[PDB]
Amino acid sequence: STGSATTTPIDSLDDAYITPVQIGTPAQTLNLDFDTGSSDLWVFSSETTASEVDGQTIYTPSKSTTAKLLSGATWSISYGDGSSSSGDVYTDTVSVGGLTVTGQAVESAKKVSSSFTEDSTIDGLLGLAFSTLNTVSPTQQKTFFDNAKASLDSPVFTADLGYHAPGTYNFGFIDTTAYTGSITYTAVSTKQGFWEWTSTGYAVGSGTFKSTSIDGIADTGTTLLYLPATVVSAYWAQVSGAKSSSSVGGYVFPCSATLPSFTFGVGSARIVIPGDYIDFGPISTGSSSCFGGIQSSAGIGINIFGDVALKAAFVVFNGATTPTLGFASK
Numbered sequence: 524s525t526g527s528a529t530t531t532p533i534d535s536l537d538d539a540y541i542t543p544v545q546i547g548t549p550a551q552t553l554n555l556d557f558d559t560g561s562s563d564l565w566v567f568s569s570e571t572t573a574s575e576v577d578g579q580t581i582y583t584p585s586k587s588t589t590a591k592l593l594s595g596a597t598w599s600i601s602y603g604d605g606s607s608s609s610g611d612v613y614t615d616t617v618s619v620g621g622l623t624v625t626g627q628a629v630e631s632a633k634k635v636s637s638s639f640t641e642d643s644t645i646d647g648l649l650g651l652a653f654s655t656l657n658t659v660s661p662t663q664q665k666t667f668f669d670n671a672k673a674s675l676d677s678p679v680f681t682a683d684l685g686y687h688a689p690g691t692y693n694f695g696f697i698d699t700t701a702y703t704g705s706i707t708y709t710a711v712s713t714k715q716g717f718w719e720w721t722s723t724g725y726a727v728g729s730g731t732f733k734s735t736s737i738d739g740i741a742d743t744g745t746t747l748l749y750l751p752a753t754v755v756s757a758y759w760a761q762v763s764g765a766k767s768s769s770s771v772g773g774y775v776f777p778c779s780a781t782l783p784s785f786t787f788g789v790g791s792a793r794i795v796i797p798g799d800y801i802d803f804g805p806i807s808t809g810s811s812s813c814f815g816g817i818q819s820s821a822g823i824g825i826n827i828f829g830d831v832a833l834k835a836a837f838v839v840f841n842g843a844t845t846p847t848l849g850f851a852s853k
Contacts, residue, residue, distance in 0.1 A: 524674045525695035526622025530557065530684065533644040536803050537830060538746050540684060541645060542692055545618040546629060547587030553580050553646035557692055558744030559682070559718055559840060560827075562656035562666050563600050564617070565608060565630035566647035567639075575635050578643030584631060590615045598630045598658045603745070603823065608635040612659055617667060619649075622694050624671050628657075628664035648744070651680065651840065656716035668694070668842060678842045682743055683853070684834035686800055702837035702851035707792035711846045715825075717742070718840060720848050722828075723790060725750075727758050728783030732793070739826030741833060741840070741848055747803070748785070748796070749820035749827040758785060758817050765815070771806050774815040778805065785817060787832060789850040796835040 530542040541554040546566065553566055567579040584590040590613045599609035610633035617627040632647070639645070650657070654665045672678045675695030683701050684690040691701070712719045717740040726732040737750065755774065759765040761783050765776040776782070782798030801816035816831040839849030 524622055524671070525676055525693070526618075526620040526671075527691060527693045528620030529689050530692050531689045532685065532687065533642070535687070537684075537687060537834065539645065540690070540743070540830070542619070542649070544649060546582055547584070547615045548589040549587075550618070551580075551582055551587065553582060554644065555647045555649040556645050556744060557651060557682075558648050558742070559651045560740060560742035560744040561600065561602065561648060562650040562652045562654055562716065563598060563630050563658055564628065564647070564649045564667055565598065565600070565610070565632055567635070568610070568631040570610060571632045572634055575640045577640050580646045582629065582631065582647075584613045584615070584629075587615055589625075590629075593628060593659075593662075593664075596628075596659050596662065596664075598660070600658045603827075604638070606636045606638040608632045608639060610634065612664070619667065619694065620692070622671060622675075624667055627667060627670055628659060630659065651743070652718065653713050653716045655713070668840075671695075672842055680840050680842070682833060682838045682840065684743070684830055686797075686834055690834070697839060702853040704852055706837070706839060706849040706851040707789045708839070708841070708847045708849045709789050711848055713846060717825075718846070718848055723788030725754055725788065726786040726793075727761050728798075730761075732786065732788065734788070737787070737826055739820075739828050741828050741838060743830065743833060745827045745829030746816075746831070747827075747829050748801075748817045748831040749823055749829065750817065751826065752819045752821045755817055755819045758783075759815065767819075768812075771812070771814070773818040775806060775812045776815055778811050778813040787828075792850065794832070794836045794850055794852060796832060800831055800835060
């Protein structure tokens with residue numbers, strides 16, 4: 524089997540992407556944030572504290588004839604950006620772009636933190652990291668991809684995120700029309716539960732490529748590119764007027780400046796992030812100071828190849844017995 528679904532930016536900055544997901548019988552369609560940096564499928568629901576729901580579409584298990592309470596199961600998650608949610612668990616039928624899993628753990632939120640309430644466009648998350656990160660207790664649950672894997676034509680999914688435009692998540696096949704050149708594959712460590720790999724270096728604009736190993740994660744659920752402070756400093760030094768602002772919480776730059784591209788290495792191959800991808804607009808409405816899309820990972824404890832980087836490529840998440848990652852230009 525295969526599945527194919529369109530993923531759409533939630534706003535004009537590509538702060539995140541939502542993908543429609545059918546849950547239950549009859550189908551309840553929720554727009555979920557596909558997150559290769561976590562491993563819980565959770566949704567706003569009929570069980571969510573009423574004061575914490577503000578415009579989201581909710582999953583109502585009692586209206587689904589295929590929903591079953593996972594007795595005794597609870598979940599609780601906290602994300603890198605400080606947000607969190609928690610609740611209980613149902614199993615139900617979940618379909619993504621024509622691909623159907625029966626018995627998928629659907630984690631029903633009883634509580635969500637402010638940032639989730641305040642984002643009306645995201646109805647939940649669908650985790651696509653490794654199932655070892657899943658938070659369901661006492662019995663850890665599998666991700667949608669893990670459950671689908673054996674049925675897929677090929678044990679892979681691909682992320683093709685758009686710049687200021689819709690893109691695609693495919694399951695089970697590689698669309699050879701969706702990228703240019705060849706796909707370069709690189710080794711993955713699953714030891715922290717992430718799609719963790721090592722980039723071979725970087726270049727800033729037309730600058731010379733610096734060969735240096737950068738360990739990080741391919742994370743569709745993180746907006747920006749977080750890299751070591753040395754790298755990030757070398758990038759913003761090429762932008763006139765750019766500075767790191769502690770009050771704002773990272774690098775900002777005059778909206779009148781021209782951003783150079785940023786290149787990262789995948790083996791001997793090179794992915795170029797156009798400068799425009801690194802512009803995340805005014806820090807506040809009407810401000811001439813713009814927020815940068817490349818920021819320091821210092822004190823995150825890991826480098827993160829978020830959407831800014833991933834949307835410059837066609838990315839293969841290869842869930843073969845030994846997982847790997849593939850990157851192609853497009």
